[PDB]
Amino acid sequence: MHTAEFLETEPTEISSVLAGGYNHPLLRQWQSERQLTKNMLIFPLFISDNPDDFTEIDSLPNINRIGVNRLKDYLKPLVAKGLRSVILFGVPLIPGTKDPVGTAADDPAGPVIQGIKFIREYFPELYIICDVCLCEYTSHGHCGVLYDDGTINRERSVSRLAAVAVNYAKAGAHCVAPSDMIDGRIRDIKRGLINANLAHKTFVLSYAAKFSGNLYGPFRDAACSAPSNGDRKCYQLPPAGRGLARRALERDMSEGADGIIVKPSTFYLDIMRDASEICKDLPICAYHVSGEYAMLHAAAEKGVVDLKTIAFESHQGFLRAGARLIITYLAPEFLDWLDE
Amino acid sequence: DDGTINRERSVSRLAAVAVNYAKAGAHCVAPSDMIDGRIRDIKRGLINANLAHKTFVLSYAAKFSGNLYGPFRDAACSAPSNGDRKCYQLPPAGRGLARRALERDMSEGADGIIVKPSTFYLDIMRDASEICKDLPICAYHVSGEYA
Amino acid sequence: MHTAEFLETEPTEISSVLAGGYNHPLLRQWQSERQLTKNMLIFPLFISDNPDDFTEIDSLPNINRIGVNRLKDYLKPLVAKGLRSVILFGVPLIPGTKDPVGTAADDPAGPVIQGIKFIREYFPELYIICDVCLCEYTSHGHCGVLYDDGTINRERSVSRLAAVAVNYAKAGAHCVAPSDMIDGRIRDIKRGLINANLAHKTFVLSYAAKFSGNLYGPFRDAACSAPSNGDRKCYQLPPAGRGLARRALERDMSEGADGIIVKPSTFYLDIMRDASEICKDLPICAYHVSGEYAMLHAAAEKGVVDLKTIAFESHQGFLRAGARLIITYLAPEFLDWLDE
Amino acid sequence: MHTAEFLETEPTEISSVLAGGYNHPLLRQWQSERQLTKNMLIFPLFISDNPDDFTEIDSLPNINRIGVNRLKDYLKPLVAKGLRSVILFGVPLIPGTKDPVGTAADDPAGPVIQGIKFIREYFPELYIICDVCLCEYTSHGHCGVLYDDGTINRERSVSRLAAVAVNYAKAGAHCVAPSDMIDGRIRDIKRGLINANLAHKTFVLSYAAKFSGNLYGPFRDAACSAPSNGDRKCYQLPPAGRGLARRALERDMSEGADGIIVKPSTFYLDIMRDASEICKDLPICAYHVSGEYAMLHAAAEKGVVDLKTIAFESHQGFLRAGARLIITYLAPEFLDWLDE
């Protein structure tokens, strides 16, 4: 007969015994270095220039493009359940709005500044963040102003972006979040705010480590921000580029960033850990991007995972890796779940 | 009897299984049990069997409990029973426990380490790259991640 | 009888046992922190101003000086086997070309810019690096512009070098690699590229740690770059000068270097290890120099070592010490060997 | 006309200027963190069991196999010129001496103990180091005692090696240098010396980082130590194995090593730099091995380098990388050169 063999063993070494720390549900909470709370949540809003818009974005489940006259009814139950912050994206659909220099980016009649004004009046306690970039406003769809050869013009781009950021601040945004990745734009935006007497009021939340890759699919359908001729791989960081990311984090801190965003999130958790050392004195924010979010939904609907469960797992993952803030399309679900 | 794991009897049984696989010809043994101190016992086992100089010990040092093992439970028909794996698999928030587990398994004889799952635990790979800088680090792209 | 004595021993300590990690051929691969691949290879080309040149360089085995009308037939099998990058050196032999300010360094009719133009057209996927210096173009053979007392004039040298580098970039080089070692030249080259709207397109690969010594013998016969009155020991680093090397690495990083070269290679592996910490976020490149290469051939032909074997040993040595790139005269051999 | 272009430059930054530190011959000495002196030199001796031997070793230039009755005349001019230390290797050529357990390794009639006795009497101020291994004494040529399957038996090997080391110490060696690389042998040798009341008198100089590779060619002809069936790659470290080397250094320190050797030397300078941190409180020794030495001679005779020059360059390289001791076949040349 084959029988169960047991080797002769030595007495347990105290150094081997970890189990005393996680044998009860409360202990698995004690073991967290940071717990998820409501105020860590930042919810994106896609504001249409059709004020009566409330259009579902196919590829981004449960998320709509919304006009200003639909915003009160949408935000009311969210703020009531504890929402503290939103990040605005403009989606102007009126024709002849987009041009090579992203003129409409800071149009006082455009959806972002209209959205700032509405929110400041109707939800005066909500903290408003605005994405700062030109890609939703350029005819070529790229994030900066281009030379003739289709490459980005750094100087003209950062000049245009500094203006957009300051103008959002002038209109009432509390926070500007430059997502363009163009070399040195944080310096120029910070100087811009200083010259406008707004730097002591305006948090600069840099997307310091934003990577190029396959996880932005459905975003390109909600904000109608698709490039044109070439790719984003010359300013967005290459996925293998840890050294570039570490240098970008150091740079943006140096140039005035009050906080930093790592994007995407789950697939870049090691870069959050890198940022937690490089940017240890600053808030670090995870951006759970469109492709990551849609991936979770796809897997959940296929029976691979449980949506709430894997929501909690991934979002606790951000906190473990060093983030203390989360931009996420699941904020409405969490405002309910964190009650329970 | 109370359905909790018996450490001493478990590591004794696991050391035997590992040595017997090595005896049969495996080049490498990869203990996935997460039970406290099993690497020490497996390494001593191999030493006593004159196989430690031939057998790579690839510890699953940082293996987390969670929602990503669904389809594995259908390919290897390895489903628990009464209770969960959360008392030996690490809690997903447990970075401190993971760092201590990495240090422990290195100390106890691991030639290499596995972090599992992978994508959702990339920060723990980065932690391991410092703690276990002189050892090979292995990522396990698990069933739920793949699916 | 003298008999074999065996001392009484204690049971094996687990801490003593390393052998489980390297007892199989695959494990000796697992133990490498970086494996050699084709794309890490950079092959030097010595371009003649006689367009029909294909002259073997005596002291540098299997390496020729080549004119442009011979380049297609030479590069074709190499690119076909996976060559990704070349580094160009100009060897103008027409008389009355060399002068005290290295005027011909950026002659649009000279071999480097002619070689850039040819390569950009015939091998549009090849990544082109150009050595930047004046020594192959000066009548005195030194790397910079000189004062009357034969010492290098820093200001005039860096001004001239910045121009040469920008002009190579203007002509099409993807990468400029300043090999002059003159204090502060990286700053001036980077500013030059910025002013020319080329810094976002041009990798700056500094020879940051280039040492004076006995290993450049045969180079002086392939590029006809011999000094004159004095030696290179006042700008090339002294071989014992670790402190100077560490400061040079930090300096060039600060001044804009995208990557760094350590030269020579094998005899300076400790400096690669130093650079891997100081320049941890940048690519580090090893230059397997003429004397090192010829030394390997000499020893192999004498039966001391096996050429392929010691090729692999030395080049894996670079990777172990922290390099991720290699400039080597054995690139053609490796493009075959890495297949096997 | 193509004219020499000079870009507009900014005033020199003080941070760019390194040149003030190395513009004079004395400064290039000031820049060394460690200068080469005579007492750092350790010269290998290959002692024959034919007492009248003085046989040149073909592949190892200017080096002989020597019997005891030839040692006085050979060592006299060397000690007179400042030689402080030797490392002994036994080459027994009498038939029927080698056996599977290396019985003759510590034969009181064998060349090592005869050489210790002679040196202790005729050169009482010379510091004597003995290589400790079994490979020059085993019939299979491997460094330890083997299982039947030709693999090394750790326990029996370390037991045999501890005995050999203690017996050399008993005979008069000041220092034992275990070159076997078998897991845990330093612990056993140290315990051996402790039990023999010799640990307070006996320096343990571990070959802690000894790599497998192509640089031991001519050694295999001077000490007639060739393996048999299989290779040394299961105990000697793989050339890519930095992690294993770092762990071996830490291990041997822990187990009692008073000093450590890195071998080979030039091709492993990065590992010397690693050892200088891990083993910062211990003497580090470079072993300029047979293949490295013969490589220098081959290149020098081919005109690639100058022998004295490249001797100084490579040996200063060891000191730069952190060694303070050198085992070298060029010790006789240096005892003359360091005068000049």
Ligand SMILES: *[C@@](O)(CCC(=O)O)[C@@H](C)N
């Ligand atoms: C980002 O790439 C979009 C986020 C997403 O895809 O969900 C920039 C445009 N903020």
Ligand SMILES: *[C@@](O)(CCC(=O)O)[C@@H](C)N
């Ligand atoms: C692991 O949890 C299974 C891997 C997978 O789910 O793919 C252990 C059982 N090796």
Ligand SMILES: *[C@@](O)(CCC(=O)O)[C@@H](C)N
């Ligand atoms: C270098 O010193 C030459 C390389 C070699 O000798 O092979 C400079 C001139 N790039």
Ligand SMILES: *[C@@](O)(CCC(=O)O)[C@@H](C)N
């Ligand atoms: C070493 O490998 C030999 C040195 C040399 O080859 O010169 C051991 C046997 N000490």
Ligand SMILES: [Zn+2]
């Ligand atoms: Zn954009």
Ligand SMILES: [Zn+2]
């Ligand atoms: Zn030069």
Ligand SMILES: [Zn+2]
């Ligand atoms: Zn040996």
